[PDB]
Every structure is written in C-alpha cells, then in structure tokens.
C-alpha cells in the first residue's frame, strides 16, 4: 500500500530546480511541497509550488498545484439511474481530473500549505491548476518539466503582481514613435500544435500579429528580433439547421481552441488576453475560414473531404473532387450554394488548461450565481485596455456576453500510424465521410452530441462508443472541456473599439 | 423523440466584415 | 448544475 | 523587447 | 465525507 508517482516526481523537480538555480535561470525564493493522498484522504496526490511575499505587513502566498493522476489505482465510479417504460437501469460513468479539484480539495491544500510554511493566517491565492497527464515517463521528459516549472514560477509572479497592483497594459504604448506598423499574418496548418507537456492540439487556421519595423536601409538581413506578439489557433466546423426538404442548408461555426502569446514574452496579464482574442475576428477578411476546405493536390486523407456535402443534397451520390475538371472555379459555387456566407464564433473553455484563470472566469460570466461580478470585471478589464468609454459600443447591463450551449467535449489523443494526433479531428464532416450512405447513423452521431432529451451521461457513452468505432482502439482521454458561443454584437463592438482606440493593423 | 438540428445556432452570425487598414 | 470553482478575481 | 523590461517577471525563458 | 477515497 503505497504511491510511487509522487516521491520520484518530487526528486526530479528538486533536481531540476537545483540545476536551474545553478545556471542563474531562477531565484531561490520559492518552495516545492508534496501533497500526499494517503495522509490527507484526497482523490489524487499533487505537487504545489508556493511563493510568498509581504503586502502592507500581511503575508500573501500564491500556489500552483499540479495534479498527479496514476494509472495503478482506480477511483470509484459514479452511478446514475434512468427509466424506460417499466424498467430502470444503472449507468456507470467515469470521473475526470476536473471533478477531483473541488472546493474541499483546495481548502485542504490551502490549510496544509499555511501550516507547512509557518503562517497560519496568511492569505492564499490560486494561480491555476495544471494536471500532469498519465502515461508519461518522467525519466526522459526533463525538458517539458523544466519549461513547466519555469512557467509555473512566471504564473505565480504574475498573480502576485496583479494582486499587488501594477500599470495595466494598454495599446496606447504600442505606437513605438519610430515609424513602424503592426501586421497580421494568416496561416493554414495540417500538423497539430503541441502543449508544454506534448499534448497535441488541433489547429487548422493560425492568426498571428507581428511588428514590421522596416524604416530604411535596414541591416541584419534575414535576422529578426522576436517580432511576434500573439497567436490564436482556430478550426472550423459545420452545423446543420433543422429545415425540412434559398438559404444554404449548412452554417459554418468557427471554434477557437488555443490563445497564447509569443515565446519570448514572459509576462501574462489580463489585458493581453483580449488583445490576442481580437485577432480571431480578422480571419474573415478574405473568407480565410474556408481555405482548409479546398482540396489539396497530390494527397487525399479522405477524412476532411468536402465532397461528402453532396450526400444529403438533391442528388444522393457524393460530389467527386480530385478530378481534372474540378478546380476553384466551382468550389466557390459549391460553397455559395451550400454554406452560409457568415461564420459563427465559438470557444472551447477548459478549467484545467494553461489559461484556466480566464476559462473559469468566462464560464462564470456565461451563467451562474456569479454572473454580474464576472461581467463587470470583464468590462473593467476591457476599459483598462485601450483607454475607456466602452459603453458607447457595448451595454453589458442588457446584453449577454457569452452563451452556454450545453455541450461537453472530451479531450484526448489517438496515435495515428505516423504520429500521435488529436481526438478532436473527428467532427461532423469526418463522421459524414465515415458513414457513406447511412443517413440514420449520421443522425444518431449528431444527436449523440446535442440531444437535449438524452441524459448527458448517455450522450457521453454514445460519444465514447463512436470514437472507438471510427478512430480506433488507441484513444486515450485526458480531460473535459465545455463549448460556448460568443455574442454576435460583442465581437464587432470589441473590434470597433480597438480600431477606434488608435490601433492600425495592415495585411493582405 | 429524434434530433433534427440546431435551432439556436443561426441566431448568432457576424453581419459585418473584418476592418483592416490594408 | 452550474458547478463552480475557486477564482482569484473574487 | 521592451515588454519584458516593462514587467520583469522573475525566471528567464528561452 | 472524504469523497473519492476508499
């Protein structure tokens, strides 16, 4: 009766911290502690990185817990009952990392930290949990652990500085007064992006913001000084409106997966999040959201084929791409005749990701007991970013900011033949391609996602069965995420407010 | 009861076009 | 439902 | 560039 | 109390 994935991790982290301090990379001002599950009676053991300062004589402690799930032990499952006619049955669900980190868990962690550090009445502030995925060998993953430790220290410094109170980041200071301009570059990708711990993330459209400083006969050709600010990963999905059979049958919804800053920038502040998120709306400058749909020349993975859209069209068969006659001449005609011109913007909020502190805030703003406070905080932050007077473009009193669609998305990875990929590659188009002519199977798959009648546990069961049926037997789930839809007017108001606030971005 | 589609996705759609200096 | 978690803002 | 010097969070990266 | 622990 013992746990062996905590002591080894603690030893590795202590050695890494010693090495980093030796190389003059960090400062010996933080502590690393172990949260054993055996002597605290908690679901999962965790590692906490605590850094403390003093504010007006009151000690303040910032903590960044790291959950350590283990595959050698099984947590008890959750039972639910549903009724069908005269018979009742029991469904056995599964428990994720997110449900483990509850209020009681954080309370016990804070009490333990306060007792350990010698300060019983010290204030404790969270900095954002980040679980360490299982099936990861700690012996040969030193680089990821080092980067994660550095990022955790940076996050603790960020939250401490935010609590202390510093100058907000504003776009008025981005002028540079040196005759430079900001340019935004769009990009279409096919290989998934990677997290700080190697977790793949699906990313088809990437929007970045750079600084263009070409003044004159500039020297240092082919050399750039970290001219990059933001990066947003987006991918498009198709949704079908319930109309019986001039409006196009399908409507395109764009999902935002990851928002992050440049690698060089070591600071993360709330006003940077909105500035980075404002780049999402710029993807509609030249219908760039439709670029991944066009066929590529030479290869055909047959997973993202757009010809499947003809399965439910007036003609039963599928439209055949990869043909000599087919080109961009009638690809536009197809998109005009079967896709709505305007897209929809959605975000996949995750309470355990790197940007947990904003995903939780947006989830609270979407709906709950803390609905007014979150909206007021968001409005205050947006006012702080770029001067003020946001009331002229938006009115949070009588206008929702974020809306919850009641959809839960699993987070996992499946090992393709070549390399590990992301579980979110399976979408409506992928399912339509998988089920060639069987309309009933596609309708069942679509209902397994957003059926309001079905219990969420049953929908999750059907979604887990479909993934095994289509993708393969190598699927490995890692977490949970929730999908939300932004207000249509909010995005436009934010974009117009930033544009009027002296921000000028040029591109193709 | 059988699913038929999303009757609420069509309410939120961007009407304007991205504003860039170009 | 609408389960919530700790928030540093409030 | 100047952003890092304006905030100066402890812990060098890259 | 002590949920998720046996």
Residue numbers in the entry:
A (entry chain A): 62 to 306, 319 to 581
B (entry chain B): 590 to 611
C (entry chain C): 622 to 631
D (entry chain E): 48 to 61
E (entry chain D): 280 to 285
Question: What do the authors of the reporting publication say about this deposited model?
Answer:
In response, one family of large bacteriophages uses a nucleus-like compartment to protect its replicating genomes by excluding host defence factors. Here we find that the bacteriophage nuclear shell assembles primarily from one protein, which we name chimallin (ChmA). Combining cryo-electron tomography of nuclear shells in bacteriophage-infected cells and cryo-electron microscopy of a minimal chimallin compartment in vitro, we show that chimallin self-assembles as a flexible sheet into closed micrometre-scale compartments. We find that the shell is primarily composed of a single protein, chimallin, which self-assembles through its extended N and C termini into a closed compartment.
Further reduction of the structure to focus on an individual protomer resulted in the highest quality map at about 3.1 Å resolution, enabling atomic modelling of the chimallin protomer. Chimallin folds into a compact two-domain core with extended N- and C-terminal segments. The N-terminal domain (residues 62–228) shows little structural homology to any characterized protein, adopting an αβ fold that is topologically similar only to an uncharacterized protein from Enterococcus faecalis. Although chimallin lacks the acetyltransferase active site residues of AtaT and related toxins, this structural similarity suggests that the jumbo phage nuclear shell may have evolved from a bacterial toxin–antitoxin system. The chimallin protomer map contains three interacting peptide segments from the N and C termini of neighbouring protomers. Two extended segments of the C terminus (CTS1: residues 590–611; and CTS2: residues 622–631) establish inter-tetramer interactions. Notably, the binding of CTS1 to the chimallin C-terminal domain resembles the interaction of the antitoxin AtaR with the AtaT acetyltransferase toxin, further hinting that the phage nuclear shell could have evolved from a bacterial toxin–antitoxin system.
